[PDB]
Structure formats: C-alpha cells, structure tokens
Amino acid sequence: RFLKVKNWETDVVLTDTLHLKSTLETGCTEHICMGSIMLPVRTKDQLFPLAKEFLDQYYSSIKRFGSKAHMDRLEEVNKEIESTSTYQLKDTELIYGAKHAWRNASRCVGRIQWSKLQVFDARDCTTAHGMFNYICNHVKYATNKGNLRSAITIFPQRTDGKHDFRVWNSQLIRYAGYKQPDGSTLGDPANVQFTEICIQQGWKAPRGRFDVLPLLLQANGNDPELFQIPPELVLEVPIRHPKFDWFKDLGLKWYGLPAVSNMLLEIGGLEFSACPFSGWYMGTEIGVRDYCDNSRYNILEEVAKKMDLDMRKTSSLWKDQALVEINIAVLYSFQSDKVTIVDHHSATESFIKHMENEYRCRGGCPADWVWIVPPMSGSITPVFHQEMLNYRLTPSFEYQPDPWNTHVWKG
Amino acid sequence: RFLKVKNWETDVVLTDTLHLKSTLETGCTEHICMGSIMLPTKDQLFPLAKEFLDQYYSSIKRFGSKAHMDRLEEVNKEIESTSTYQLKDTELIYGAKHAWRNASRCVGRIQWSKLQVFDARDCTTAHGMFNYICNHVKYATNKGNLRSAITIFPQRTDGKHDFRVWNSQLIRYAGYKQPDGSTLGDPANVQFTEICIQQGWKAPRGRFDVLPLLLQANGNDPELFQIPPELVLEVPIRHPKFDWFKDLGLKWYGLPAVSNMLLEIGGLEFSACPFSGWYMGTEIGVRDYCDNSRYNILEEVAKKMDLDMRKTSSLWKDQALVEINIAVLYSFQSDKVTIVDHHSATESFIKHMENEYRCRGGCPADWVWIVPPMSGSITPVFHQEMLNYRLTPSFEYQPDPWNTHVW
Numbered sequence A: 001r002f003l004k005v006k007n008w009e010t011d012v013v014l015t016d017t018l019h020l021k022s023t024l025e026t027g028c029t030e031h032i033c034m035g036s037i038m039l040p041v042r043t044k045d046q047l048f049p050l051a052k053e054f055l056d057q058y059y060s061s062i063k064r065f066g067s068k069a070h071m072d073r074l075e076e077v078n079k080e081i082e083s084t085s086t087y088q089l090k091d092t093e094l095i096y097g098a099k100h101a102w103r104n105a106s107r108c109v110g111r112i113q114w115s116k117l118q119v120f121d122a123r124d125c126t127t128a129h130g131m132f133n134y135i136c137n138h139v140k141y142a143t144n145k146g147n148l149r150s151a152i153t154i155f156p157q158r159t160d161g162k163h164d165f166r167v168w169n170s171q172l173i174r175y176a177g178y179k180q181p182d183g184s185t186l187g188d189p190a191n192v193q194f195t196e197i198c199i200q201q202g203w204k205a206p207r208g209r210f211d212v213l214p215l216l217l218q219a220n221g222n223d224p225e226l227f228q229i230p231p232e233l234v235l236e237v238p239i240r241h242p243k244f245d246w247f248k249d250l251g252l253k254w255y256g257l258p259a260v261s262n263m264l265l266e267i268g269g270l271e272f273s274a275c276p277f278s279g280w281y282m283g284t285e286i287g288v289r290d291y292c293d294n295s296r297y298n299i300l301e302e303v304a305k306k307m308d309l310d311m312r313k314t315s316s317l318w319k320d321q322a323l324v325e326i327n328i329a330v331l332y333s334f335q336s337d338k339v340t341i342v343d344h345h346s347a348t349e350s351f352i353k354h355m356e357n358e359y360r361c362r363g364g365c366p367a368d369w370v371w372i373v374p375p376m377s378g379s380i381t382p383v384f385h386q387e388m389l390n391y392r393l394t395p396s397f398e399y400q401p402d403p404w405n406t407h408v409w410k411g
Numbered sequence B: 001r002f003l004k005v006k007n008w009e010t011d012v013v014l015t016d017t018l019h020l021k022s023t024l025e026t027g028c029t030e031h032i033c034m035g036s037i038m039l040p041t042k043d044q045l046f047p048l049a050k051e052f053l054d055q056y057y058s059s060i061k062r063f064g065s066k067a068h069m070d071r072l073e074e075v076n077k078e079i080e081s082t083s084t085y086q087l088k089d090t091e092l093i094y095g096a097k098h099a100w101r102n103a104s105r106c107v108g109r110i111q112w113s114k115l116q117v118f119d120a121r122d123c124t125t126a127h128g129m130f131n132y133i134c135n136h137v138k139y140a141t142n143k144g145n146l147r148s149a150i151t152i153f154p155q156r157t158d159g160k161h162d163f164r165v166w167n168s169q170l171i172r173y174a175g176y177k178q179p180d181g182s183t184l185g186d187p188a189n190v191q192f193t194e195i196c197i198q199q200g201w202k203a204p205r206g207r208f209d210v211l212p213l214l215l216q217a218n219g220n221d222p223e224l225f226q227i228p229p230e231l232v233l234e235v236p237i238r239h240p241k242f243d244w245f246k247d248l249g250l251k252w253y254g255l256p257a258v259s260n261m262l263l264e265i266g267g268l269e270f271s272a273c274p275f276s277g278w279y280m281g282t283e284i285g286v287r288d289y290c291d292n293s294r295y296n297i298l299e300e301v302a303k304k305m306d307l308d309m310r311k312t313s314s315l316w317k318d319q320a321l322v323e324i325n326i327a328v329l330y331s332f333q334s335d336k337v338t339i340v341d342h343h344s345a346t347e348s349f350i351k352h353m354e355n356e357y358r359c360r361g362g363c364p365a366d367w368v369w370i371v372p373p374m375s376g377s378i379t380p381v382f383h384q385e386m387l388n389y390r391l392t393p394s395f396e397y398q399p400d401p402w403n404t405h406v407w
C-alpha cells in the first residue's frame, strides 16, 4: 500500500511506502484522531524478534544482508539472549541505532543533520560521579566554544528495571524555578518541582532569575546525587535587541546548548533510560516558548510596556508585535556572540528539503505536523502547507515517567 | 474508551464521552496518523434517518414519546415508498445548527445555535437560486453588523438533479494569468475565473474584480449572475500608522461565505448550502494576503517598511505579517464591519470547548485547523489537546462541479 502526501503551496506530491515498516501504535483509530495529544523489565520471549528486526535493518544499510557476518551475529545474539536474558550491541550497532532514533523522531525539525551525530559510549559507566564526568565532557564537546556539535551520551541499558541509570534533570542545562510565599514565581516556572527536589537533596540555591540547576544523577538504580556543572562549561548569552537599547536592561540571558536528558532510547529491544542528547536551538524555542508562554518567563507584557504598545485591546496585536521583537533579539544576540542558532524560516525550509530527500531515498519520513510547525508565523513557513504522515519507527526516542514518581528510595 | 483532554497551560482536564457516538471514519489507523492530510439506497437511508430523528427527539426531551415514535414510522413509511424523504422545518434547522456544531475545523462554533436558516428547498431555477443568495448576502451583511446564515437548496435525488453553486465562496476576487507569466488578482481563482469567461463573463481584468455567481439548478447547465455591488460590502485596507499603506491598493470583502460544501442530515444530501459567518482577522491578513500561492504581498510590504530583507534571520517576514494583520483588523473596525482577532476567537473557542464538554460530553476539534496561522503558541488553543472525530449531521467536502457535470 502506497500513500501520497501533498504540499499545497508547491503542488509537489510524495509517496510513502516506509509506513509499512511501522510496528508501534499512534494512539489513533479509524474513529478518532489523537494527533494533538502530547502523550497517547522485558522478557526473552519478545526480545529476539526485536533484536532480529533491528540487526536486519543494520545489515541492509551496510549492504550485508544475508551475509555470513549477518547470520553469525544473528546467531550470536540469539545465544547470548537465552543464556543471559539480554544482549550487548557492538559499537557499530549502537552508533547506527542512535542516528536512526534521531532520524525517526517525527517531532524533530532538525533531522536534516541526522547523519552527523557524535555518539559517546558511556556503557562502561557505573557511578553517578562517573555519569557527571561523562556529561561534562558531553557539554564541553557539544558546546565547542559556541560552534555547536550534535552529540549523545549513552549510559548502560536497563536490566531488570531495578538498576536503571537516569538523569533526573529534563535538560542538562536549565534554570531554577522558585515558588514564592506570595504565589508568584522566581525564575523558570517549568522547573519549580525539579528545583524543589534539588534543594531538598541538599542543593544550596542562590535564588535568582537565572540559576543553572545542578545535575541530579542516578546510576545502577541507586539514589541520585547532585553535581554542579563547572560554570565555565555553561555557555550563556545575554539577550539584547539590535534597535531597542532598553532590551538589554530586561536582564535576560539564556544558555546555548539545548540538551534533552529525560528520554528513553530504544535500540533492538534494548532500553537506554539515560541517553542525554544535544543539538542547537531553533530561535522560537527560546523566543516564543521559553520567554513568552504564559506558564514560563512571560515577558510579553513587560516587553510590550517598554515598547509603548496599545495594550488596551488585543485587536491591536500588541502581543503578536512584542513576540516578534523578542524573537528578533534572541537571534541577534546569539549571532553576535557566535553561538550556533537557527531561525524558524531557515530550519523549516531545510526540513522540507530533508523530508523530500527522505521520500526519495527511504520511501518516507515520519513527521508530526503539530510539532514540526513553528509556534509563531506558522503559515509563512513552508511546513504549514506540507501534509505529513505520522508513524512510529524503531530505533526510537520515547517518553518515560519522571524518575521521582517511580524510584525506590534506598536511603 | 472514555478519553481525557488536557490543557497544558492551565492543567484543566476534560473527559470526552461524545466521541463514542462517532459514526464516520478519520482516515487514521493505529499505525498511521493522517491528522494533517487535507482530505482523508433505502436500506442505507432509514438507519441514517433514525439516528438523526432519535437525537433530534432527544434534544427536545420527547425521546421515546409518541410524537417521536410516530415520526419514526411516518419517515420509515415515506422511505419505503418514495425511496427518499423530506425534513420538517424544525428538523432542518436543528440539523443545520448541528452540522455547524460538529464542524471540527471551525473555530467560531461558540455561536453555533444562533444560525439563521433559509429554507430554499422550493427553488427550481438558477434565477431563483440567485434571488435566494442575494437575500442571504443582504441579510447576513446587515450593513456591516454580520449575522451567521445558511440557505439550503433542494436535496440531491438521483445525482442527476444536483443543485450546485460553482463558486467556492459567494464573494471572491477573480484571478488572471498574464502573458507576463505572472498572476494578476487572486491566484486561487485563476481556473474559476477561466470558466467564468468560458461561460461568457466579461472580465474587467483588475486586481480585485468581484467574481460573478455561477449557479446550477436541478442538474442543468450553470448560469452567470452578477451580485448587485451595493450588496457586496468591501473594506479599503489602511494601516493605523503607515500612511503609505493605502497606496498598496488593498481591499477585502466583508462577507465570508463558504458555498462549495455538502450538508448531510439524516442521510439526506444538500449539495448546495451556502453559509456565512464573519472573518477571523488572520483568514484575510495571513492566508489571503501573505500565502505564497495567493496575493503574496509580503515582499512589497517589507520593501515599503525598509526592512533588511537580506536574511531570513531578521524576521522581516514576521514583522510585516503582524503590521498587515493589524491593518486588517484596523480597517474593518474603522468601517464598523464585524471581524474578530485570533486572540479573542481562540479564547472564545476555549470557553466553547468547556461548555461543550460540560453540556454534551465533548467537542470534536481539529487542532491543525483551530490554531491560527500566526502567533500559534500565544493563543490559548495551542496548549489545548483536542480530539478529532466526525459527528453527523455534517458539512463534508465534495468534488468541484466542473469535473462532474454532465454537460
């Protein structure tokens, strides 16, 4: 079964055969579409077929399907599985797996870069302190003095699910959020719960509007531990506007390295519960979501006041106007400090090309429209006009419950 | 099976049960989501008619009543003998209001029950069709105090006698391809403007020529009719700060009136059912003015603003887009023609969602369409999870007539 998708700005049509290789479930049925829903221990029983299917893709990509290298590895994995209940990936397989999980991330607009991923193998790690060291090296390599590089560090896979490695932070770099007695919130409101935990676990909080959270790291199912990233490793950018000289006085800054650290990486049935990864920011992530969401830094008003905008009627589009300048400022600041960043027009255009290239060479490109489309200026970016099929390939990056909700405290 | 939807900006959770009455299909499966695809007999008819009449008689608290049971038999009887059946005016209005209610792609559904329904089922000719449309236009415009309306022509019979309005909207601007290879006026209408000339329209070949109506009655050949200008309210677009803006030569019409959809009620098919509300600002400002496949004026406006169009990263497209939309809302409000901004509209829809969960157990909605084409995440519907499914009575798309019409 072939499936066609159409771009309504260019009339270009594309055919998807790739969706046939999709195993996992979407959350939709023929009677309901859940495409706007954010969120719609494993036995030898089902592991080898997962292992086989993965190793089969692997060997096709290296053009060795059916070869002796292929069959012996299939056999080797099998024996390791019924003997030891699990198995270990070669380095070559891990790398491949990581690249492809990225490649299959239908919510990521930056996948054009997917082949250029630096994979760090932390599968020999045993302690939190070990984890800290690995992470710092990640933050340094990926940061590269502002010329950012894509990277992922991969810690040991899950075993019985009682010895998980986890990074409790949702991102490696992120600002504290303090709930005040008067109900207001100092810093980033998203991180309030996580800030509290840190404080409880012994973190001494400066209590400012931009405090870099400590890392809270869990190795082998043990209680997590705190570590303070060397400040000299944390690239930050002061935010200023190129025309408005009062903008700098808003006292805003942001960090350069966007690094997701709470997802689960699945390769051939293997589950890697600690797999922090990092690219570079698309402007709107900071400019629109981080700064302007009502549940985040919410600087819309305070910015709009200083702009002297008609704030009396929403039909003056003061909000829309302010949003744009803030985003302009974010891009300006980063380029001025030579820290890698991409604007939403640039990124979306690249993605369309990437996506086209992927139908040609791969027969499809899973993509979540709800997420691919930028959160401002939607229809003047080409992805808005782009039909997109969403499905789930493996390897994959999956969500996983917050570890404070599951962890068994040793004490 | 009993679903919950979460707003991620307010933590409000609504439970959806209404979806369990969904009848038609979405085109999605368990393996593939198509939520961003634009378009995914007597034995057939009676069950259809029953489902409708049941929910109708339930809505009027006479479910199971004799009137209910009687009507069920009465309609059953007619289907058996005529192969079709006809709707009572009460049923016709309820069906219409409810088709709008179920329109998961329409952000303005909070107004759903204040729909004026015009029964035009006694229409026989295109000339008659013109008269009804003109009356609809005039009523809904209301000198600029817009009122929602639908005018409903006779239902399909054998598919040979279909009524159709060929225009996609009652009021649209023509589009002409130049020898220049460029496109003057509205590119979305190039092919329709063609057929208009092909049927005999004398195009003034301007940028903003109001298209004529091309009406088809009882399956006959369609006929051209020009809407009396004095019934077509237009707004000259000026910016409330840029005086150079007026020289851009921009204007838009006030009445947004979809005319190409198919209205399904209790199995019956109304292939001609023009309906109209009032514009959300971005419909014109973002989509009509700035889509690349449309009037595409962004460059010209940016040039006029003297913005560094050298790099995408100056967000100059973004900057202009805002001003242009300010202008549109400005012009309409200055001429006292009803218009709603994307902020008020989406806020209204959030409220409507909460009422619908509370009074009906849910609200089908298509996120890809409800989120406005600008400033997505600063409207509240962005952080609102929505479930999409198709309820009936319904507005469905249907093929353009020039591909179907037996000439």
Ligand code: HEM
Binding pocket: A098, A102, A105, A107, A108, A109, A110, A111, A113, A117, A150, A151, A152, A277, A278, A279, A280, A281, A282, A285, A342, A347, A371, A397
């Ligand atoms: C290199 C430049 C990159 C850019 C510009 C980029 C862009 C984005 C953006 C804007 C999002 C939306 C995040 C949100 O709205 O919450 C996203 C999501 C995502 N990206 Fe990236 N990305 C990049 C690199 C990467 C890398 C290196 C990986 C993994 C190896 C990756 C995997 C993902 C995944 C798995 C998601 C979905 C996360 C979720 O569901 O919460 N991306 N990407």
Ligand code: HEM
Binding pocket: B096, B100, B103, B105, B106, B107, B108, B109, B111, B115, B148, B149, B150, B258, B275, B276, B277, B278, B279, B280, B283, B340, B345, B369, B395
């Ligand atoms: C009264 C104020 C109204 C507002 C503010 C409004 C708003 C909108 C908007 C913004 C769209 C998106 C259109 C697009 O981007 O192409 C839409 C579509 C739609 N509206 Fe409304 N509308 C209104 C009245 C009505 C009425 C009176 C009806 C029916 C009786 C209706 C039914 C629909 C339907 C069926 C669609 C989907 C059409 C399609 O799929 O192309 N709306 N509406």
Ligand SMILES: Fc1cccc([C@@H]2C[C@H]2CNCCc2ccnc(-n3ccnc3)n2)c1
Binding pocket: A038, A039, A108, A171, A258, A259, A260, A277, A278, A279, A280, A399
């Ligand atoms: F399922 C959810 C329930 C609540 C909140 C949520 C927030 C959206 C998820 C965050 N998504 C990742 C955001 C992010 C931050 C920093 N860097 C990236 N990033 C880096 C490379 N690619 C993306 N992404 C999900």
Ligand SMILES: Fc1cccc([C@@H]2C[C@H]2CNCCc2ccnc(-n3ccnc3)n2)c1
Binding pocket: B038, B039, B106, B169, B256, B257, B258, B275, B276, B277, B278
């Ligand atoms: F699937 C498609 C293929 C080609 C064009 C397409 C355009 C989106 C459909 C138009 N949607 C209606 C636009 C419109 C215009 C004027 N008024 C309204 N309107 C009025 C009240 N509610 C909506 N809607 C879809």
Ligand SMILES: C[C@H](O)[C@H](O)[C@H]1CNc2nc(N)[nH]c(=O)c2N1
Binding pocket: A035, A036, A037, A038, A370, A371, A372, B008, B382, B383, B384, B385, B386
């Ligand atoms: C409810 C809704 O699906 C949710 O807010 C989504 C919408 N699209 C998004 N798109 C991106 N890139 N990131 C997000 O967090 C979201 N949020």
Ligand SMILES: C[C@H](O)[C@H](O)[C@H]1CNc2nc(N)[nH]c(=O)c2N1
Binding pocket: A008, A384, A385, A386, A387, A388, B035, B036, B037, B038, B368, B369, B370
């Ligand atoms: C590809 C995508 O489905 C298509 O561009 C949709 C996106 N959302 C839309 N939303 C509205 N309101 N109107 C539209 O025409 C569209 N087009």
Ligand SMILES: [Zn+2]
Binding pocket: A028, A032, A033, A034, A035, B028, B029, B032, B033, B034, B035
């Ligand atoms: Zn779906």
